[PDB]
Amino acid sequence: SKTAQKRLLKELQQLIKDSPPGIVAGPKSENNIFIWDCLIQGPPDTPYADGVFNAKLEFPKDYPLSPPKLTFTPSILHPNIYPNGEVCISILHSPGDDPNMYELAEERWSPVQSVEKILLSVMSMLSEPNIESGANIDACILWRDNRPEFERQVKLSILKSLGF
């Protein structure tokens, strides 16, 4: 918990100076560093391009051993996002039982991963859904089968949210 704090401080300090394009994240209080707020803008050529989404990132006491919990406050339409708003991707997961297999490397969560690696994963996620870690059934069979409707659907909500 005190080790997790020394850790979160560097990543935070590092992010603020070399902040990834289209993303701003950080805590509200100088003391509660275990809860961050995010503002992720949809990447360029994705049906999200125009939208801007709010997300909450919650870190456990044993960070970086255990991953944080990313959750888009107002849940959006995506096969890798549960209806409650919780983001499900392999980077936010434990290696498993036999972490030595050639796969894991990049994909699973381990102390070699940064929060930036996560935000970066979230970005390509909005561009490239990973059906292996599908968290929303409908969003999955919609994106898979009738994609034009999916992109139509996702773009309607972005419009609506703009006070339209």
> What does the alpha-carbon distance between residue 112 and residue 83 come to, in Å, rounded to a whole number?
30
**Within a 10 A sphere around the Cβ of 107, how many other Cβ atoms?**
16
Strands 35-41 and 69-72, bridge-based pairing: unpaired
Peptide bond preceding 64 in cis form (omega within 30 of 0): yes
**Within a 10 A sphere around the Cβ of 163, how many other Cβ atoms?**
5
Cβ–Cβ < 8 Å for 91, 109: yes
> What's 106's domain CATH number?
3.10.110.10
**Within a 10 A sphere around the Cβ of 150, how many other Cβ atoms?**
22
Expressed as residue numbers, the domain containing 22 is 1-164
Question: What's the number of domains the chain is made of?
Answer: 1
> What does the alpha-carbon distance between residue 123 and residue 41 come to, in Å, rounded to a whole number?
9
Q: What resolution in angstroms, rounded to 1 decimal?
A: 2.9
Cβ–Cβ < 8 Å for 105, 47: no
Q: Which residue in 55, 58, 62 sits closest to 111, CA to CA? A: 62
| Catalytic (active-site) positions | 88
For the record, the structure tokens of 75 come out as: 């849940």
